[PDB]
mmCIF file of N, CA and C in Angstrom:
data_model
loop_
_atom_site.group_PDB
_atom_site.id
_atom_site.type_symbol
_atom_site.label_atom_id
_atom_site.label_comp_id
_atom_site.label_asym_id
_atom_site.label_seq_id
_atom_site.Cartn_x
_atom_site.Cartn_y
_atom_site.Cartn_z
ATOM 1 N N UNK A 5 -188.023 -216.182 -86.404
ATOM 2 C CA UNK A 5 -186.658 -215.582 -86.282
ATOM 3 C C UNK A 5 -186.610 -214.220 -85.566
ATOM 4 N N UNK A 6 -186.948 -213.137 -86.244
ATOM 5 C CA UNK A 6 -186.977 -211.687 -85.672
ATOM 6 C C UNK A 6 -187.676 -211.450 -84.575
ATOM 7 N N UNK A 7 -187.334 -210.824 -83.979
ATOM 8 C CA UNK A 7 -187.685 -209.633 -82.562
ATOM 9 C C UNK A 7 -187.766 -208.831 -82.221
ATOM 10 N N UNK A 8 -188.283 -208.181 -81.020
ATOM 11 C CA UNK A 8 -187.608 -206.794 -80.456
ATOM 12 C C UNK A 8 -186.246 -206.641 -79.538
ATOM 13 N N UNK A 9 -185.382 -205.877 -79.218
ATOM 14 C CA UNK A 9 -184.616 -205.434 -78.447
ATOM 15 C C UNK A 9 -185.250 -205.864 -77.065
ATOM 16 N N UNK A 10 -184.637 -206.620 -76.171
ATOM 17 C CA UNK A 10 -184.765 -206.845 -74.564
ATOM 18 C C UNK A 10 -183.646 -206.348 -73.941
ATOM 19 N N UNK A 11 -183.779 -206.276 -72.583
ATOM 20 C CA UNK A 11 -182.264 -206.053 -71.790
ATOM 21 C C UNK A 11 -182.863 -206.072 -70.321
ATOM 22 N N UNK A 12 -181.372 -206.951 -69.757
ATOM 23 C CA UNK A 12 -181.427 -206.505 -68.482
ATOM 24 C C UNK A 12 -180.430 -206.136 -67.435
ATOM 25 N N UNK A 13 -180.495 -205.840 -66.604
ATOM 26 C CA UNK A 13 -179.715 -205.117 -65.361
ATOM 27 C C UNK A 13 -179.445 -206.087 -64.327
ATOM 28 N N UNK A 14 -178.293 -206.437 -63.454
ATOM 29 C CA UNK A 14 -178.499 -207.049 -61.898
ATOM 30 C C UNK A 14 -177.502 -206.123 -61.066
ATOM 31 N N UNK A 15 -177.801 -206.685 -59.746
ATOM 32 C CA UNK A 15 -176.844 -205.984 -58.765
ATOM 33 C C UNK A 15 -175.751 -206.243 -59.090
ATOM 34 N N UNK A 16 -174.829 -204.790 -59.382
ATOM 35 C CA UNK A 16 -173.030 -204.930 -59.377
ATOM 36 C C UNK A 16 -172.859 -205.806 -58.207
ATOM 37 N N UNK A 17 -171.404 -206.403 -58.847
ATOM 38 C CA UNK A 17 -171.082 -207.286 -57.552
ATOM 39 C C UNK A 17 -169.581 -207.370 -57.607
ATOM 40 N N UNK A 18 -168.773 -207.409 -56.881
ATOM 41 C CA UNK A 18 -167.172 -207.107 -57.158
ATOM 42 C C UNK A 18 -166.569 -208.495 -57.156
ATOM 43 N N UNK A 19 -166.003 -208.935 -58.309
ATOM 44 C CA UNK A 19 -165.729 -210.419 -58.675
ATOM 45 C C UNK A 19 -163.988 -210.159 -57.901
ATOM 46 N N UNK A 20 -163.522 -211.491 -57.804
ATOM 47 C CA UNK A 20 -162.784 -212.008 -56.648
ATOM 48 C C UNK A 20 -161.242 -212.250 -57.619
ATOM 49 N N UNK A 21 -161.214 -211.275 -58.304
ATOM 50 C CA UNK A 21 -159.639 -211.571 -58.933
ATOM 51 C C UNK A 21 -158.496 -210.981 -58.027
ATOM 52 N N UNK A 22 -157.791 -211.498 -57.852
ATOM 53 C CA UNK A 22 -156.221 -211.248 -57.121
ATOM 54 C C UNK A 22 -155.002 -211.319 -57.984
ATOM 55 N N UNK A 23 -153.924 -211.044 -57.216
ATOM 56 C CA UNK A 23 -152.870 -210.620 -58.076
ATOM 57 C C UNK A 23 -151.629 -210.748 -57.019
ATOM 58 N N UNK A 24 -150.662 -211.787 -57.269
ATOM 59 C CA UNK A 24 -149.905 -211.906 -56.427
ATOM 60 C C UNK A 24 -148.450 -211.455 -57.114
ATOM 61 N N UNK A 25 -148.297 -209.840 -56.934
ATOM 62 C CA UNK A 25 -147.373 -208.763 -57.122
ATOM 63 C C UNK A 25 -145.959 -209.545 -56.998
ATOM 64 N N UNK A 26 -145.041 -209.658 -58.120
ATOM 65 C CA UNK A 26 -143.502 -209.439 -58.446
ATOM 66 C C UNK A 26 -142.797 -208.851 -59.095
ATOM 67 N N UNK A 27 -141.513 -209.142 -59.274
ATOM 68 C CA UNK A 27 -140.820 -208.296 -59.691
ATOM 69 C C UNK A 27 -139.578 -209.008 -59.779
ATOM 70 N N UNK A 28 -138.403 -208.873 -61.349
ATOM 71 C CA UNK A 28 -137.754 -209.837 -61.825
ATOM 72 C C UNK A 28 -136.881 -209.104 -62.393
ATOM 73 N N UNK A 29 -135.408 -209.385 -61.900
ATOM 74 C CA UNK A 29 -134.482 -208.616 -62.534
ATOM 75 C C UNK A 29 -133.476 -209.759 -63.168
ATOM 76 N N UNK A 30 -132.348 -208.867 -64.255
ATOM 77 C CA UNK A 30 -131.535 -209.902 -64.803
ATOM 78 C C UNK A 30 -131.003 -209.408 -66.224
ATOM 79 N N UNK A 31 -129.799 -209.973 -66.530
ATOM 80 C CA UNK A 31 -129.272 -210.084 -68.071
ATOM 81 C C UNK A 31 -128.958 -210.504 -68.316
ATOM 82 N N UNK A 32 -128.977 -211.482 -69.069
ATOM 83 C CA UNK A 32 -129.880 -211.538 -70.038
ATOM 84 C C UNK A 32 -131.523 -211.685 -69.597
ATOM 85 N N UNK A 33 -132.581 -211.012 -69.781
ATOM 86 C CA UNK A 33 -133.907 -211.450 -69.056
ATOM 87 C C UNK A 33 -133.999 -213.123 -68.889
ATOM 88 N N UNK A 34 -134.420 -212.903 -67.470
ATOM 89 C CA UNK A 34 -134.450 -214.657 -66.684
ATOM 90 C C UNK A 34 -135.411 -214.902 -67.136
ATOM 91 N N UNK A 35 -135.731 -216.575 -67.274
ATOM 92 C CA UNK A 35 -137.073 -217.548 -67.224
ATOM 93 C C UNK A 35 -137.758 -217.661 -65.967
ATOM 94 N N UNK A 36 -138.936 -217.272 -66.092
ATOM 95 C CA UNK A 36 -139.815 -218.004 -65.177
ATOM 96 C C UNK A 36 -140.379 -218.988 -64.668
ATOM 97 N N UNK A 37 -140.907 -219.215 -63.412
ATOM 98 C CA UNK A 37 -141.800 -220.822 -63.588
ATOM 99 C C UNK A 37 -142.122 -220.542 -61.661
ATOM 100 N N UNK A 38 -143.468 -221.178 -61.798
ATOM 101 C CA UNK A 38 -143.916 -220.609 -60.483
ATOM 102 C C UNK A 38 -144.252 -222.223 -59.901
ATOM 103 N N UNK A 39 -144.411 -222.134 -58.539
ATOM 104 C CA UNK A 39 -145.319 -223.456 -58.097
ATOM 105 C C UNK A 39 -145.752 -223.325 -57.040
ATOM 106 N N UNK A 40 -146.411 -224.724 -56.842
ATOM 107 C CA UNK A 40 -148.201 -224.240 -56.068
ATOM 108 C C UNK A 40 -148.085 -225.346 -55.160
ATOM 109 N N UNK A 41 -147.287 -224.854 -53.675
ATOM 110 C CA UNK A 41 -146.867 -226.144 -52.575
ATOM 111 C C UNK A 41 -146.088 -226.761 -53.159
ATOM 112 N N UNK A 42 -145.427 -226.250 -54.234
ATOM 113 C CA UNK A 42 -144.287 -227.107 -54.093
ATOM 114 C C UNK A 42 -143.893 -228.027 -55.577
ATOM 115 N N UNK A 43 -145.114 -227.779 -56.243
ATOM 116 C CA UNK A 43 -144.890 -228.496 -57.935
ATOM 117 C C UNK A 43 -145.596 -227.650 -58.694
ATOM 118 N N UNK A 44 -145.066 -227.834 -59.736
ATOM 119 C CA UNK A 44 -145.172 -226.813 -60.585
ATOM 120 C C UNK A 44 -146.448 -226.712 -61.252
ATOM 121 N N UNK A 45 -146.774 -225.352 -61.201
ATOM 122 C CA UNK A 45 -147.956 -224.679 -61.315
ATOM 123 C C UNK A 45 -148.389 -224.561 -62.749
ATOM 124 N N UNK A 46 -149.254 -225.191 -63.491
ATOM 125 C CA UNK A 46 -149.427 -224.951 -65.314
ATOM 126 C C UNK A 46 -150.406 -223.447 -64.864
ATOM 127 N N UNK A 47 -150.083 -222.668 -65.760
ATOM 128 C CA UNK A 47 -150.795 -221.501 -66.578
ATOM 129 C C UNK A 47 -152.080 -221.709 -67.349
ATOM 130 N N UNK A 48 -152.903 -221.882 -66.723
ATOM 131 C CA UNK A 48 -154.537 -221.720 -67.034
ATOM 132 C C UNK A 48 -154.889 -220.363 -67.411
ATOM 133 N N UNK A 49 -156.199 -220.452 -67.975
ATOM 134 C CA UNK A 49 -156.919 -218.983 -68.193
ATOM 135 C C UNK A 49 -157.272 -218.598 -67.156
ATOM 136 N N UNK A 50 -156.833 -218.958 -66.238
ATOM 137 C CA UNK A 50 -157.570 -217.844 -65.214
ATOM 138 C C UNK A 50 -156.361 -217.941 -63.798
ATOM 139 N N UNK A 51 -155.170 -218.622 -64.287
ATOM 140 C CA UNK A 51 -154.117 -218.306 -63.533
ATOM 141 C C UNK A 51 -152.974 -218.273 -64.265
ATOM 142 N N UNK A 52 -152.541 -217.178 -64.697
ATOM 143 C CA UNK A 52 -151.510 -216.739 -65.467
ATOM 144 C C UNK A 52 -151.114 -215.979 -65.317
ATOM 145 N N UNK A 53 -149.384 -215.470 -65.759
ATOM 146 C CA UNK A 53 -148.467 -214.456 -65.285
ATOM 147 C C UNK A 53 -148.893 -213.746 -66.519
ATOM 148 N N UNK A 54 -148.657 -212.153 -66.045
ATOM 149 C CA UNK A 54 -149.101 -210.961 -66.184
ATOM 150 C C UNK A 54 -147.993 -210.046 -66.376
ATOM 151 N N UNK A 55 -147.197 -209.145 -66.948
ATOM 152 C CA UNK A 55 -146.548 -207.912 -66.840
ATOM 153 C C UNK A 55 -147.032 -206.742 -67.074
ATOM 154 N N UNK A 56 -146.450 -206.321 -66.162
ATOM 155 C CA UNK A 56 -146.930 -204.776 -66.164
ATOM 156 C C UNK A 56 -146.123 -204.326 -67.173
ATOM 157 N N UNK A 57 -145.820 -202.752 -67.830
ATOM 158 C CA UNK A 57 -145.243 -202.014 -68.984
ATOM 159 C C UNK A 57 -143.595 -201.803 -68.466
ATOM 160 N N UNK A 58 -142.971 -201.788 -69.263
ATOM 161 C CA UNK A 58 -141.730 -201.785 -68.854
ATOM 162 C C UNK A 58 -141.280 -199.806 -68.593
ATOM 163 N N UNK A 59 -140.663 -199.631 -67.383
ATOM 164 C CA UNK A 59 -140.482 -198.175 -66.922
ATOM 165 C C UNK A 59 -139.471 -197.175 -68.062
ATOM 166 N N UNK A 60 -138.376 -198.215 -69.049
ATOM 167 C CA UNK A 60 -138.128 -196.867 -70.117
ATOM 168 C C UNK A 60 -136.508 -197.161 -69.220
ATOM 169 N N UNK A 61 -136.693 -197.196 -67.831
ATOM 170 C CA UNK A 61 -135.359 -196.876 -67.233
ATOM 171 C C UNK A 61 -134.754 -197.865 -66.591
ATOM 172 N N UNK A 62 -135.467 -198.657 -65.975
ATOM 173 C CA UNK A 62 -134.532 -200.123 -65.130
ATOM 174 C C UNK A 62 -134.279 -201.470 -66.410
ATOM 175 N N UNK A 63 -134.234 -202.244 -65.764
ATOM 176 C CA UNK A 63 -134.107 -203.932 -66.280
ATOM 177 C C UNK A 63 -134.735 -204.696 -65.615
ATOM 178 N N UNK A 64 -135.748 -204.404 -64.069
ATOM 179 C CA UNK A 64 -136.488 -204.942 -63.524
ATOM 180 C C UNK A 64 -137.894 -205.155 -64.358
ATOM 181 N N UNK A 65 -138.675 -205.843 -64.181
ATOM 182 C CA UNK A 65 -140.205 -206.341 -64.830
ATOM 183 C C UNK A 65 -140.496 -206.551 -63.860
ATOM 184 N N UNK A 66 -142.024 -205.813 -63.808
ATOM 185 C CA UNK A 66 -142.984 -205.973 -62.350
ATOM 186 C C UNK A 66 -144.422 -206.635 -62.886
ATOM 187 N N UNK A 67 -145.108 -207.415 -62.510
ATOM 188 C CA UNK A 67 -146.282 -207.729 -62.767
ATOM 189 C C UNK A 67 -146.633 -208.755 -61.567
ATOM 190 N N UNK A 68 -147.636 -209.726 -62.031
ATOM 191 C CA UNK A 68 -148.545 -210.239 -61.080
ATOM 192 C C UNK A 68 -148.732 -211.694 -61.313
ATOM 193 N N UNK A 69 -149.197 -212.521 -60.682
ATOM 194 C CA UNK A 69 -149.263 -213.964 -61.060
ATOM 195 C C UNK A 69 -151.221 -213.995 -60.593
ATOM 196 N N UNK A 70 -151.588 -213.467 -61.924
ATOM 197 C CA UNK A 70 -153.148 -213.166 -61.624
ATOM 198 C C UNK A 70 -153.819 -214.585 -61.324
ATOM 199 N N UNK A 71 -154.856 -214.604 -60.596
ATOM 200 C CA UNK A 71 -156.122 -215.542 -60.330
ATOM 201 C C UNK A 71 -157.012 -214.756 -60.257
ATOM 202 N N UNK A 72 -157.921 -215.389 -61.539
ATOM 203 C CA UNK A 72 -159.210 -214.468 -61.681
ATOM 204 C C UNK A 72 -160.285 -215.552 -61.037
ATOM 205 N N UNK A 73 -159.971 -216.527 -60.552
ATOM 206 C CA UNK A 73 -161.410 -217.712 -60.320
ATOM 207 C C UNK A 73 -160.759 -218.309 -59.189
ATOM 208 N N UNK A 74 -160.140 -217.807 -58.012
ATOM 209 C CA UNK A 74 -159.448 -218.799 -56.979
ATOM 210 C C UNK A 74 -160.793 -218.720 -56.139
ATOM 211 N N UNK A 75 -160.547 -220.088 -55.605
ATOM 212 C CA UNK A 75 -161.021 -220.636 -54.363
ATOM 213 C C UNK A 75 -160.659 -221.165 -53.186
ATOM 214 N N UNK A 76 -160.581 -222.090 -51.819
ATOM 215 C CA UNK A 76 -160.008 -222.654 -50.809
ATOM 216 C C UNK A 76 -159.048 -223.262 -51.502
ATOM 217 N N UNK A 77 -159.198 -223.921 -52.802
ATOM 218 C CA UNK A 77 -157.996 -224.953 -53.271
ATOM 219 C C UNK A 77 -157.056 -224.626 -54.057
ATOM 220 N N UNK A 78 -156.973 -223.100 -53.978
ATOM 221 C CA UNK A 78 -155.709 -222.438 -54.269
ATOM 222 C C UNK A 78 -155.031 -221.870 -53.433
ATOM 223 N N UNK A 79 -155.785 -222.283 -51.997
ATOM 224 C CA UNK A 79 -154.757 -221.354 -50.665
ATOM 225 C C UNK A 79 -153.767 -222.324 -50.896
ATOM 226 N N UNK A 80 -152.313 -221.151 -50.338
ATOM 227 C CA UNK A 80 -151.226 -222.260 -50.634
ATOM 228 C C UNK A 80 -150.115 -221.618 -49.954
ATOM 229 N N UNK A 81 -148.698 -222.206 -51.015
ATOM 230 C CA UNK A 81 -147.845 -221.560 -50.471
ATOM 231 C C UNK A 81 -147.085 -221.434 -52.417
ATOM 232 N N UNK A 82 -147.101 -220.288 -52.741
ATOM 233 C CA UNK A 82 -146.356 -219.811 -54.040
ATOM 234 C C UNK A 82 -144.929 -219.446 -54.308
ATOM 235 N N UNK A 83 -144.443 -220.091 -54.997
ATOM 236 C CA UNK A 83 -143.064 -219.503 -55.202
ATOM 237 C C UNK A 83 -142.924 -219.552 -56.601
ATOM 238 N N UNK A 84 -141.959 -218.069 -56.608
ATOM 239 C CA UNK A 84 -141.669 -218.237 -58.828
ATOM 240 C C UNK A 84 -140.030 -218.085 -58.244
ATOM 241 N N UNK A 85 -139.438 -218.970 -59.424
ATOM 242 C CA UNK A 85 -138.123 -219.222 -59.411
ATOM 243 C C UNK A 85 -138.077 -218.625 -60.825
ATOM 244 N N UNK A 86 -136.585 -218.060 -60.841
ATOM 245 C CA UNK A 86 -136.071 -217.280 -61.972
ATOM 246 C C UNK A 86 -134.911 -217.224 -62.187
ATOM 247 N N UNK A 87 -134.209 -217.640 -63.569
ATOM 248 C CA UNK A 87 -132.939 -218.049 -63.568
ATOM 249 C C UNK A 87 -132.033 -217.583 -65.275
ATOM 250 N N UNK A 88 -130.944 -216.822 -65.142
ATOM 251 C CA UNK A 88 -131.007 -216.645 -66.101
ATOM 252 C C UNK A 88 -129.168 -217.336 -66.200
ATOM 253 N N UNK A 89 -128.335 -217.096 -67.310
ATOM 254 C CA UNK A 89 -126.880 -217.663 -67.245
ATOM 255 C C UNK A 89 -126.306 -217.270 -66.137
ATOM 256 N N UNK A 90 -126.574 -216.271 -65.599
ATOM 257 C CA UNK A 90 -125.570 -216.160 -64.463
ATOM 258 C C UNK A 90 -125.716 -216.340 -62.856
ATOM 259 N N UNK A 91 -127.035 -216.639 -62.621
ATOM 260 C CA UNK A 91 -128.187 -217.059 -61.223
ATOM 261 C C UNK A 91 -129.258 -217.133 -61.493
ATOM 262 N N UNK A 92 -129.463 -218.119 -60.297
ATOM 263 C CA UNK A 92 -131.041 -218.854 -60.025
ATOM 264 C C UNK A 92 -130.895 -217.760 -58.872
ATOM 265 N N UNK A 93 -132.953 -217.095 -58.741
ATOM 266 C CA UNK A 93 -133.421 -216.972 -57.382
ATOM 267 C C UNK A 93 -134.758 -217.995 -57.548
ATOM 268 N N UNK A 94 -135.259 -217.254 -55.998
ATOM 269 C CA UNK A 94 -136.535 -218.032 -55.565
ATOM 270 C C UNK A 94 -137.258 -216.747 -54.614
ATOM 271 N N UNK A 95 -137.980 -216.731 -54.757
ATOM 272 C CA UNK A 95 -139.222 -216.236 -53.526
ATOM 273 C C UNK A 95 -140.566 -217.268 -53.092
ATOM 274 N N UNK A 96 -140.845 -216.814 -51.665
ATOM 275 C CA UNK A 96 -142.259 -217.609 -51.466
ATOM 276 C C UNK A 96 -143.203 -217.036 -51.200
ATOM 277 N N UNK A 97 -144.146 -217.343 -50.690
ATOM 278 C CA UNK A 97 -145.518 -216.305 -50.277
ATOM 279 C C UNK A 97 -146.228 -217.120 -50.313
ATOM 280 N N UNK A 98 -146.851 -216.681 -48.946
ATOM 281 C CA UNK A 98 -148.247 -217.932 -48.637
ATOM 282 C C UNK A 98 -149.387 -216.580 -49.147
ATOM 283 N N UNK A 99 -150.457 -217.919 -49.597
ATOM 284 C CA UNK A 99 -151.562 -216.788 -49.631
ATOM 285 C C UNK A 99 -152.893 -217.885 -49.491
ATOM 286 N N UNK A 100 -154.043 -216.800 -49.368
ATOM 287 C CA UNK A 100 -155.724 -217.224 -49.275
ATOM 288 C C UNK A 100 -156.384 -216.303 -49.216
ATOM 289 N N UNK A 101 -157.343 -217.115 -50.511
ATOM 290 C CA UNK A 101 -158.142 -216.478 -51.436
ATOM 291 C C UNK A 101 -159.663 -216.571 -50.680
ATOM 292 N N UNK A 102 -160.135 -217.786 -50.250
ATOM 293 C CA UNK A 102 -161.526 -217.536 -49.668
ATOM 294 C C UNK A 102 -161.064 -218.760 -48.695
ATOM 295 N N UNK A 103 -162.049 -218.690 -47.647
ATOM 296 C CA UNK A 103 -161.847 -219.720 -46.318
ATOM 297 C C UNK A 103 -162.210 -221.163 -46.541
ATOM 298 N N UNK A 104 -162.068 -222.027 -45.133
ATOM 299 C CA UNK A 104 -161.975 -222.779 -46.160
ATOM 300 C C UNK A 104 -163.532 -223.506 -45.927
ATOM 301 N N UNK A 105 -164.266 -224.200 -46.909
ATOM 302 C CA UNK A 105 -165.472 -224.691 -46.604
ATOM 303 C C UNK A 105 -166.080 -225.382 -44.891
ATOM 304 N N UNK A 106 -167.548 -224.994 -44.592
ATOM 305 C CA UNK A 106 -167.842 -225.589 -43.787
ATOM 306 C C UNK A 106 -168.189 -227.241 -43.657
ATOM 307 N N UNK A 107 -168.339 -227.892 -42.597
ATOM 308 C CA UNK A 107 -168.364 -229.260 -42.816
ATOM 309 C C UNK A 107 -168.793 -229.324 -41.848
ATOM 310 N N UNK A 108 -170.159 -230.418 -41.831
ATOM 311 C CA UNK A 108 -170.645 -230.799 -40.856
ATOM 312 C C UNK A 108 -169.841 -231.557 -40.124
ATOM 313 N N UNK A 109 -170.913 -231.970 -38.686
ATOM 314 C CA UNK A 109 -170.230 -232.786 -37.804
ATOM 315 C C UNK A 109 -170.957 -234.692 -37.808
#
């Protein structure tokens, strides 16, 4: 069973999380729902909406639609729709996260 204390060290390395920045106004606060080309996107652990702290002074909410593990097969095209009793919006945004794989000939 028992031992001594081990440990070890490797090269820092800067891991590949992103954050695709919004911002959501409304009153009564709107619902969210995002999608990924075009159908709707489920909320995984490692792609999920995020808020930042609320400022004290607006009714806007700013945060992020984080990916902590994207790869080529999350380049896309994103949109979060938000809708509360009195309007629906929409925004889009293309994005890419790493290129896309090589392939032989």
């Amino acid at each position: 069973v028992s031992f001594p204390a081990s440990v070890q060290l490797h090269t820092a390395v800067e891991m590949h999380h992103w954050c695709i920045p919004f911002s959501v106004d409304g009153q009564p606060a709107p619902s969210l729902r995002w999608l990924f080309n075009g159908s709707v996107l489920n909320e995984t652990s490692f792609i999920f909406t995020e808020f930042l702290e609320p400022a004290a002074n607006e009714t806007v909410r700013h945060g992020c639609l984080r990916l902590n593990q994207p790869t080529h097969v999350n380049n896309g095209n994103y949109t979060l729709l938000a809708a509360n009793p009195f309007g629906q919006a929409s925004a889009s945004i293309m994005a890419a996260f790493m290129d896309n794989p090589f392939e032989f000939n």
